[PDB]
Amino acid sequence: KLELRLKSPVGAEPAVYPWPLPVYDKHHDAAHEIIETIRWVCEEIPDLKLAMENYVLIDYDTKSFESMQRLCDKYNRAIDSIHQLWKGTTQPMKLNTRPSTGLLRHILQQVYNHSVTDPEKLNNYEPTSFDLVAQMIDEIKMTDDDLFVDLGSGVGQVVLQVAAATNCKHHYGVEKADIPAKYAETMDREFRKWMKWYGKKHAEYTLERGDFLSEEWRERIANTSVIFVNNFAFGPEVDHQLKERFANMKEGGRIVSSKPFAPLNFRINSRNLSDIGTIMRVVELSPLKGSVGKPVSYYLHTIDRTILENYFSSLKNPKL
Ligand SMILES: CC(C)N(C[C@H]1O[C@@H](n2cnc3c(N)ncnc32)[C@H](O)[C@@H]1O)[C@H]1C[C@@H](CCc2nc3cc(C(C)(C)C)ccc3[nH]2)C1
């Protein structure tokens, strides 16, 4: 049918690619997706690499189908070879694995390229976040008991990313507007599709329609251990409304944001006991060197009512 097919490394349904090979944006074509996909699978399987590298030269002219099929076939043949070896005394790769950071960037990238049909329909109302978000996840030091929500989910790329790098129960995304929430519906599928295509595990997640300020979410925000929220352009109305939901939150949970929900040099005194800063720490996170008003940093808030307790331990016994 004048097309290309890649064979899944765990005998899942192959990836179909129509010719000519679609270009998605100024820096992303499906041609390189392929090349990437291949060398990423070569990564999981040292054997496939062994069967490929010692023969392949990696590079081909992407303009020619006669040259792209040349590679795909080579790859597809190497796959069968390994699958045969999978019938021998040797074990296959462990199926219950999470993606390595490197791999996952590529995966989410595919999910974007394939689901975002019109890369302009949202980018008009919106203004690599991956590397950034990755940093935050190491900073969050997430434990198997936490719950995560992205407030204002968008198409939920982060929702997905957290779901693959951490290890917890149903993680959630909340999106009000129909457009990005609609894209999220197919973003759900492709992600789950490609994950199976690669044979990698991901925590349960759910990309939802709704407003986070609404009555129902008041409750849920309080139950959620980890909160990512990009609040750069939020405006005082909504900013205050969040602080109240964050108030109810359990002890020790975290909030990551572009803008601080509590001042940085916050000392507790007379006319500030009502303020949210009383129940949380706010340490500043330094930005990754390759990501973009140039001067920007980030803020990690941790629920700490010992901050408060100390002030009420101090009103008893003035040492000065
Ligand atoms: C500016 C943020 C909040 N957001 C805008 C979206 O918020 C949505 N939104 C507005 N108010 C809404 C409402 N009350 N309920 C439902 N959703 C609403 C709105 O529809 C819009 O699509 C965009 C971020 C993008 C989602 C992916 C994402 N990038 C993140 C970056 C970060 C950093 C800054 C800490 C690194 C953290 C989390 C991220 N998630 C969508």
Side-chain angles (χ1 to χ4, degrees):
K1 230 336 148 294
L2 194 59
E3 70 173 31
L4 299 160
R5 312 228 280 169
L6 286 181
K7 274 174 179 290
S8 165
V10 298
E13 300 295 299
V16 76
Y17 280 87
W19 184 271
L21 288 171
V23 66
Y24 311 105
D25 64 63
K26 211 203 296 162
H27 282 280
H28 302 305
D29 59 41
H32 294 100
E33 179 174 347
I34 311 284
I35 300 161
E36 283 292 288
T37 311
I38 287 159
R39 209 164 189 270
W40 276 117
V41 173
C42 297
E43 275 293 317
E44 326 166 59
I45 321 294
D47 265 333
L48 183 78
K49 197 176 188 176
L50 262 55
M52 282 286 284
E53 275 196 337
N54 215 26
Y55 173 62
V56 81
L57 73 326
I58 293 95
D59 279 43
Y60 286 106
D61 88 287
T62 63
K63 313 286 184 186
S64 180
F65 163 68
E66 314 93 55
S67 186
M68 284 307 298
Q69 211 187 359
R70 217 105 71 177
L71 175 68
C72 300
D73 293 338
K74 288 174 186 77
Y75 163 83
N76 291 306
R77 301 202 282 254
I79 294 296
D80 299 320
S81 181
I82 311 298
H83 265 65
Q84 283 312 295
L85 218 148
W86 279 24
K87 300 162 181 289
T89 44
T90 316
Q91 269 85 305
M93 55 156 281
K94 189 142 194 169
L95 30 79
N96 282 121
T97 47
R98 276 190 274 267
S100 60
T101 306
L103 164 68
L104 175 57
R105 160 155 17 85
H106 168 63
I107 293 178
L108 290 158
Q109 187 71 347
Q110 296 181 301
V111 194
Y112 198 86
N113 298 152
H114 279 253
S115 309
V116 180
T117 55
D118 209 333
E120 288 283 1
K121 200 155 285 166
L122 57 315
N123 278 309
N124 189 277
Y125 297 91
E126 291 296 328
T128 165
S129 67
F130 174 86
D131 302 320
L132 190 44
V133 188
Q135 172 194 332
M136 303 312 178
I137 295 145
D138 292 345
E139 287 290 339
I140 284 297
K141 290 146 188 166
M142 202 178 297
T143 61
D144 37 12
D145 273 297
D146 294 17
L147 251 71
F148 168 104
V149 172
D150 180 9
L151 294 173
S153 163
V155 281
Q157 52 276 35
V158 177
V159 179
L160 304 168
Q161 179 182 351
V162 173
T166 57
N167 40 92
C168 311
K169 247 199 172 75
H170 255 281
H171 287 138
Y172 303 118
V174 56
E175 184 60 26
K176 54 171 276 183
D178 40 55
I179 15 159
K182 209 206 95 291
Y183 279 152
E185 286 170 285
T186 49
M187 270 271 257
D188 182 301
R189 264 195 224 85
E190 279 284 286
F191 177 74
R192 208 173 156 89
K193 187 219 162 210
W194 285 97
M195 288 287 288
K196 279 164 183 159
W197 194 92
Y198 285 104
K200 305 299 189 202
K201 63 171 181 203
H202 68 82
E204 311 96 309
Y205 67 88
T206 326
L207 298 136
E208 300 181 358
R209 267 152 45 198
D211 192 314
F212 51 63
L213 300 180
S214 70
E215 55 289 303
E216 192 203 35
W217 274 104
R218 301 192 79 108
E219 328 283 304
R220 298 165 68 160
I221 296 167
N223 280 324
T224 311
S225 172
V226 195
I227 289 178
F228 277 35
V229 63
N230 188 20
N231 59 338
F232 193 75
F234 258 26
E237 194 170 46
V238 197
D239 175 47
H240 209 298
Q241 294 171 261
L242 288 164
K243 299 164 183 200
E244 282 177 38
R245 276 93 181 160
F246 301 140
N248 292 30
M249 289 176 66
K250 256 80 166 191
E251 254 276 332
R254 288 122 306 154
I255 324 280
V256 189
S257 62
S258 49
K259 291 217 158 195
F261 289 98
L264 300 151
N265 53 31
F266 178 80
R267 200 169 188 175
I268 181 160
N269 66 19
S270 316
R271 270 203 263 251
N272 65 23
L273 300 169
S274 55
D275 294 24
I276 193 81
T278 56
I279 62 155
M280 70 171 58
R281 287 180 293 143
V282 185
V283 300
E284 39 179 333
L285 302 166
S286 193
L288 205 58
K289 238 286 171 57
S291 35
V292 170
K294 70 192 175 183
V296 275
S297 305
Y298 297 101
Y299 307 102
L300 161 64
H301 312 100
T302 325
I303 296 304
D304 202 29
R305 284 156 191 143
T306 292
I307 307 291
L308 193 78
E309 287 166 2
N310 300 329
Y311 187 84
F312 279 83
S313 294
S314 71
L315 288 179
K316 284 183 85 285
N317 185 56
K319 315 178 80 169
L320 280 156

